DNA sequence: TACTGTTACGGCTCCATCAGATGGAGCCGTAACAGTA
DNA sequence: TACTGTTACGGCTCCATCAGATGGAGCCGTAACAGTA
């Protein structure tokens, strides 16, 4: 009737316990990195998968999870977790549909490319379109049925299955993914959903919901990490945790009913939800000037040939289902065509006639929609620019002068200025054949990645490795006087990062973590009075307060004389907006046509808009 | 709160559907090939399994269970089924520990024997018994203890790890299997034990009986497949198969608890468990004549240079504990010594000083405890030999005379006188790559395994196919005249095949139909009126029915003038015999002397025998 | 003289055990060139 | 003349995809030899 957690002490958690009801739609709220997914995935997750798979094959367990740091775990269950841009991938190989056709034509064929090229739900009419063959692909058959119908009940039944999965939209990948491991119609299984809810308009997040609930009512325990308050909204137990983030965070808050978290006072989630902390709607949309950027004849993607108007120097917005085409209309078309026009870019932009106003700016600066990649040599020093700065610094100073140093040689990804036993890394390799990887702090150097000659230089009497195990809020004040470290130091601490070092691996970064280093990276730049900012979902893992932070930079830009247009599906975001174009009214083939374009208020007014009717709700 | 299954028709399921109460203890019994093992493992656990790891890796499943005929199952949950002489595999393999001690000594070993060759306890004791080490290596001591820990509890606490698990004893391997599958501390899953109570004495039963139940408390569902009383008078739920075997039954007979069974008249399970169909207990049992086999110094395995004494012409049984030498007593001295003596067999046998009274015998006859070898070139004529008389009578008709057809030519398994399209296999190969296989009946010789040259020959107007594709009991009467086909047609009959096929692949075969086939063809040889039959645990997989024809045949050999010794652990076979010899007290270096030996009633007024006091009981 | 026991050899089949490689992209570091203020 | 945008190349690391081999034993078929009645 519960699942009890004692000694939990992954990551960051410190020492809690916990009580998770069994068979109930729980969520697990929280600041971006405070110890949700640690807590949900690497612990409840892993130890249940890796005591149902103990009882298998051994070989085909070495081709699981890794045992976590907990004391033990009772009432424990199967674990189900649904939790890139590579050519080799298409809707095939992730659906299995092309290891069947490639099996079938190798069984039964007679010594492809129209089944391929067909769309899923051509394929499907025409299968459904000597009895040996039949015999022998029964099985094949059946799947392949099951497969198709399940595809087209997630609402992608538009696809075609040579596409890549690379370029496949969000809202479309995600419903294939959960119609695939949700399909199964097994009894006593945890599910757990890492952020469910990314890429995702308002409607598919609530047929997500439905959904979920189903399969919840079968007699299964639902563990869902969410931030979107329509999942919160939806859920018999909240398991808050905080409060703060990072090594601030770690334990749990409050817990219980949606509305024990609205009392509670010691829970931001709650106060959040209540409303005594809140964006601010602004009074008086800001008009336009007379500034405009036309785009006439769009003809990328699903483009119906529509003539859309954005205003230069207020706040607009983009929304509208997944898959209407907001990315291919903004991002394809007009992104590269300014890049091209003023950054001087050798890329070639989407199918358009022209572009007016391009005269109008005189900078364009972005952030995509595909996540950062991990790795082991970068940091948030590294990442954002600033370690080349500091590298600089203590180059400049007047032991490194007399020694000879150069500006690489403070640098634990180049030789000659790290510790040469660890290879930079600070810690050995020790692995195991068959066994999750171990960790041993490196004893040359005792994790300081740098030799004692490297050491010996040191700025302000402080050496390399203790700047960079420093975190940004000190950095803010040692590196006051100047101005571009300070700068980006600051963008960093504005962008919520105020508690996180600047030597943290980015493989241990969380996903919010991440994407907030991402974004202050691109917002540390320059701007010069008239920039064109676009940014693709930026609110994709973050909590209700780094998005109040990120709105209120934004506002900052936009009143700072440049222009912002942001592609998100969160309501807190467009409700703040001054002009929002809304695409649609349905994913794929079925849109790609202007349902709306106005004030948020006349978009509201609109009738037909699904956005229209959610901000008049909101409204 | 139920499995429902509709539509189940695998193997000789007769399309019938059945509600498996959950979170219970229910058995599932019936004679032998007459549903259960397909019902429950090919069926339940496949589509549980399935459906489970469906939701995984794609290369990690091809390295799952086939899909069964089925309509659908409601209430599944993901299902783990606990259910040869290898000498590349020992106690460190399956146990895994022989892994963990070469990753510990590839990792932090210092460039072995003295642990292979230490014993458990003394492993343990010496494990018991720089920081790095530690910290690199704290997962795998962990595991070492756990996995130590549980094989001591198993009760095989005296094993060592560098014996091979082929000569390893049933109950210390069986024990040791059961604590590592059971031991996972997991809720919500389904186990399945396909005859669990093999090679294990009453008091092992009893201690694996206790542990189910603790395991089932956790709140799990347990469906086990037994054919002993003790197992099943320990279950709130039986479902009983029938009411024949083979094509005579795959049908639900009786459901409920074990009162109403015993109430149900149509169940024959019932009607044995109540007493309305019993083994008769001989009033007087035969009392020796003098003749007496004496084997003095036993010092095989661990024996503790004890005497004992088997008479001649009498029924003789060998009892005690797992481990307690009864095999090593029995088989390996006594078996090899009768056999080097009489049949000039050139086998080395075990460690003793002499046998006395070998003299008085003229022939030896035994059946080892080992299963038969499954290969799709065998069916129940090649394997009791009838099939070499049957081609014999083939090649003496006129017309193999007048063609010159050869004894040779009427056999699949030679080329020249099978279909070659198939390879005398009678059906097509096709195999998927990632997929289970298919069975494609050929077409060129349409299932009959021989071409139209072979099927031309015909004896008494039945060619070969047709005698291969007809019963025991037809079979019968066709060879009547002559007298070995009809013995071993007899002797075939009358342990109980009267059903199955002279054709039928032993692939397909069950344990209970295996068994009785080696019965079978070891009891249709030629006896001399003094003959030795050494018997090891011949009532295994084997109903209640065929435990009571095969006590029926043994005695019938008894009185024509035999000797027969057994070495069983069931209560019906032991009750019926004339002289126990009790070997124990104890499994593995606990034991190896004789607690008790004499008539039944004497083993029983002994006090310190647990068979002694069973039988007690018993009588 | 035939039936029955053994061994011996050739060919076919099942089962437990051992214990990854590759192409694509993303990131860090350095170099080079051009526009602007 | 310095700050900031781009491209271009070498080296390091993550992730999805492809889609078994071997030694041991057991069984069928045939041959060969020996004991017994
Ligand atoms: N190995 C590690 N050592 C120390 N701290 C770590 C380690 N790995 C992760 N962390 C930190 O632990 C915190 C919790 O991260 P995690 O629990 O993965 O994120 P989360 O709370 O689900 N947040 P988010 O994904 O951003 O919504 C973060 O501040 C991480 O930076
Ligand atoms: N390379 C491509 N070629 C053809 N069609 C594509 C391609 N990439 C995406 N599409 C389709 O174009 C439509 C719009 O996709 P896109 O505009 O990228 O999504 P989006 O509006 O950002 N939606 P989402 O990411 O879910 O919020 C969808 O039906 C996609 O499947
Ligand atoms: N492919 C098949 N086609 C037809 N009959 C089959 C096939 N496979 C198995 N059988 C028969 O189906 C019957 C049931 O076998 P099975 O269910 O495996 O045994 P069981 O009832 O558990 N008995 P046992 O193992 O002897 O205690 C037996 O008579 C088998 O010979
Ligand atoms: N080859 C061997 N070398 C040494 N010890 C052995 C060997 N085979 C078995 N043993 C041990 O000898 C003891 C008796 O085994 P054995 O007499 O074969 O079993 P059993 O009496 O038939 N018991 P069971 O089969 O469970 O009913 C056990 O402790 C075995 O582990
Ligand atoms: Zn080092
Ligand atoms: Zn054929």
């Given at each position: 009737d519960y699942?009890?957690?004692?000694?939990?002490?992954?990551?960051?958690?410190?020492?809690?316990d916990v009580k998770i009801p069994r068979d109930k739609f729980v969520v697990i709220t929280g600041l971006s990195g405070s110890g949700k997914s640690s807590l949900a995935f690497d612990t409840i997750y892993a130890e249940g998968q890796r005591r149902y798979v103990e009882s298998l094959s051994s070989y085909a367990r070495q081709?699981?999870?890794?045992?976590?740091?907990?004391?033990?775990?009772?009432?424990?269950?199967?674990?189900?977790?649904?939790?890139?841009?590579?050519?080799?991938?298409?809707?095939?190989?992730?659906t299995e549909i092309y290891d069947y056709l490639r099996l079938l034509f190798a069984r039964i064929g007679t010594p492809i490319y129209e089944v391929c090229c067909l769309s899923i739900g051509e394929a499907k009419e025409f299968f459904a379109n000597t009895e040996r063959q039949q015999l022998i692909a029964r099985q094949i058959l059946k799947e392949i049925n099951a497969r198709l119908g399940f595809l087209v009940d997630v609402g992608l039944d538009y696809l075609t299955l040579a596409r890549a999965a690379g370029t496949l939209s969000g809202g479309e990948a995600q419903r294939i993914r959960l119609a695939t491991q949700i399909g199964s119609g097994l009894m006593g299984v945890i599910y757990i959903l890492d952020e469910p809810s990314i890429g995702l308009h308002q409607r598919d997040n609530d047929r997500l919901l439905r959904s979920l609930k189903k399969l919840r009512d079968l007699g299964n325990t639902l563990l869902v990490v969410e931030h979107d308050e329509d999942t919160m909204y939806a859920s018999d137990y909240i398991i808050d945790l905080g409060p703060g983030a990072g090594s601030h965070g770690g334990q749990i808050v409050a817990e219980g009913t949606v509305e024990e978290i609205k009392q509670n006072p010691n829970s931001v989630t709650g106060e959040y939800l209540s409303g005594r902390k809140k964006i601010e709607v602004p009074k008086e949309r800001r008009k336009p000037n007379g500034k405009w950027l036309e785009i006439i004849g769009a003809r990328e993607n699903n483009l119906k040939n529509i003539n859309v108007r954005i205003p230069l120097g207020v706040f607009t917005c983009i929304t509208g289902v997944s898959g209407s085409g907001k990315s291919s209309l903004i991002n394809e078309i007009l992104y590269k065509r300014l890049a091209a026009e003023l950054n001087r870019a050798s890329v070639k932009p989407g199918e358009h006639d022209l572009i007016k106003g391009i005269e109008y700016l005189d900078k364009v600066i972005d952030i995509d929609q595909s996540p950062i990649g991990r790795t082991p040599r970068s940091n948030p020093a590294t990442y954002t620019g600033v370690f080349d700065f500091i590298r600089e610094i203590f180059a400049n100073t007047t032991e490194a002068k007399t020694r000879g140093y150069k500006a690489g040689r403070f640098s634990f990804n180049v030789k000659g200025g790290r510790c040469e036993a660890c290879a930079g890394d600070g810690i050995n390799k020790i692995e195991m054949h068959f066994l999750p990887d171990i960790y041993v702090p490196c004893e040359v150097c005792k994790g300081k990645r740098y030799n004692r000659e490297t050491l010996e230089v040191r700025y302000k009497g402080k050496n390399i490795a203790e700047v960079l195990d420093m975190t940004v809020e000190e950095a803010l004040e040692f590196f006051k006087n100047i101005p571009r470290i300070h700068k980006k130091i600051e963008t960093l601490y504005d962008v919520g990062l105020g508690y996180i070092k600047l030597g943290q691996?980015?493989?241990?970064?969380?996903?919010?973590?991440?994407?907030?280093?991402?974004?202050?990276?691109?917002?540390?730049?320059?701007?010069?009075?008239?920039?064109?900012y676009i940014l693709d979902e930026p609110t994709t893992g973050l909590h209700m307060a780094d998005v109040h932070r990120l709105v209120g930079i934004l506002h900052r830009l936009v009143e700072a004389g440049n222009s912002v247009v942001v592609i998100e599906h969160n309501l807190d975001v467009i409700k703040t907006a001054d002009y929002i174009i809304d695409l649609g009214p349905e994913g794929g083939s079925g849109g790609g046509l202007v349902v709306a374009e106005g004030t948020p208020e006349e978009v509201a007014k609109v009738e037909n808009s699904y956005t229209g009717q959610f901000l008049k709700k909101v409204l």
């Open positions: 699942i009890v957690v004692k000694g939990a002490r992954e990551h960051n958690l410190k020492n809690i081709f699981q999870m890794e045992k976590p740091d907990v004391d033990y775990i009772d009432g424990l269950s199967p674990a189900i977790a649904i939790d890139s841009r590579n050519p080799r991938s298409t809707v095939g190989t992730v691996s980015s493989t241990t970064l969380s996903g919010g973590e991440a994407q907030r280093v991402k974004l202050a990276t691109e917002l540390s730049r320059k701007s010069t009075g008239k920039t064109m």
